Amino acid sequence: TDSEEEIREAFRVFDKDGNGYISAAELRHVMTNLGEKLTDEEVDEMIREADIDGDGQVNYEEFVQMMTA
């Protein structure tokens, strides 16, 4: 089970620009660097999956839950 400082370091790989949130643009960038060229629709789907509160981005606590499944 990852620590808080460990999850924060990982969160930082996704949150490229540096606001405490992961947007669909940032996630899409993470995904093709990681070899998965995804459609705007597929990306939106990945975000909706982690987007518990419904704003349209992944905040830190949502990320924690995502990282724990």
Partner: protein, 351 residues
């Protein structure tokens, strides 16, 4: 190329060694950052003097014919006018290293290091033989050199008025090669694409998500988005080396500290280019981002993934890092910076 700008020359890194560093930065697509190398170490590293590991605590010397080397007699190190407690701990530091594989070697300088010393003013002249220096240590000690048949000069000293000269012994390799300071890496920022394979080996078995599903599944897609998150998580975790950094890595019997897989690769690739030129291993441990006693060393020498180099204040370093992060390069910072109020980040910074 060998040295292209003022920063390259201020880095203290030997030109041929620096050439390999720039090649490695581009090959592995990673920005490499370094703490400046003391200019007395530069020539030694270039002509092949070995480099010290994390276990050697003994103090290096910054004066006399022994400048750049790590003396067995701490009074010959930079510790020369210190209290007795100090020279006492230093004594133990020395015997500790000698008990653990290190050798006490008689100092002999190459003709070229001898010219460098004199041209730098470390040695202000000689007797053909008897050397002079305005350093304060030359007031408690006398030194002289003697050409060997090897073309080198054996370094000898005695305490002012202690009638007999003896070899200045210096800490060496378990193989007997004298040691000088290693090259300290400040940070390594790998491009995220360096971890696609790492991610797939973890979540798939090296397959793209698509091929993994085609192969194990059948004829939303909830499972798919879930595997995609699984690869995102794995790549990020390998990028910052979450699991690797929970342990220490070793090179033979040498503790290389806390280092990620990728950072080890870099260390190995750089040491490799160093051998190719005439140097010994020059990077002996992990990055300052995993150092539990972090320094506040104000200038960082940076080599981009594109091969361009420059010196950054650390105010410029925060901006540089932000910019590189926008280009997909990964950065994680020393875990103590936040608390010391010295974070290089401007996000929330907590849970």
């Amino acid at each position: 190329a060998g040295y292209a700008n003022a920063a390259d020359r201020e880095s203290g890194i030997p030109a041929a060694v620096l050439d390999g560093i720039k090649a490695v930065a581009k090959e592995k697509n990673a920005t490499l950052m370094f703490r400046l190398v003391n200019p007395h170490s530069t020539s030694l590293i270039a002509e092949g003097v070995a480099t010290k590991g994390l276990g050697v605590h003994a103090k290096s010397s910054d004066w006399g014919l022994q400048a750049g080397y790590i003396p067995v007699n701490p009074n010959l190190s930079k510790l020369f006018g210190r209290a007795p407690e100090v020279i006492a701990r230093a004594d133990n530091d020395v015997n500790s290293s000698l008990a653990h594989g290190h050798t006490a070697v008689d100092l002999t300088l190459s003709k070229e290091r001898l010219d460098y010393l004199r041209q730098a003013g470390l040695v202000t002249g000689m007797a053909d033989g008897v050397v002079a220096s305005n350093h304060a240590g030359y007031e408690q000690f006398e030194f002289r050199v003697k050409e060997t048949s090897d073309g080198r000069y054996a370094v000898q000293y005695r305490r002012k008025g202690g009638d007999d000269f003896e070899a200045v012994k210096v800490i060496g390799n378990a193989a007997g090669i004298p040691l000088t300071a290693d090259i300290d890496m400040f940070a390594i920022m790998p491009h995220l694409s360096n971890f696609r394979d790492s991610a797939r080996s973890s979540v798939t078995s090296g397959d793209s998500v698509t091929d993994y599903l085609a192969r194990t599944r059948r004829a939303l897609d909830r499972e798919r988005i879930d595997l995609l998150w699984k690869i995102a998580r794995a790549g990020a975790r390998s990028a910052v080396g979450t699991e690797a950094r929970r342990q220490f890595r070793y090179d033979g019997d040498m503790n290389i500290g806390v280092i990620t897989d990728f950072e080890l690769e870099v260390r190995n690739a750089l040491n490799r280019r160093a051998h190719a030129v005439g140097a010994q291993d020059v990077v002996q441990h992990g990055t300052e981002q995993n150092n539990p006693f972090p320094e506040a060393d104000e200038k960082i020498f940076v080599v981009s993934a594109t091969g361009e180099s420059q010196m950054l204040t650390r105010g410029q370093l925060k901006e540089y890092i932000g910019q590189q992060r926008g280009e997909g390069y990964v950065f994680y910072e020393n875990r103590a910076y936040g608390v010391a109020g010295k974070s290089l980040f401007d996000d929330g910074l907590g849970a």
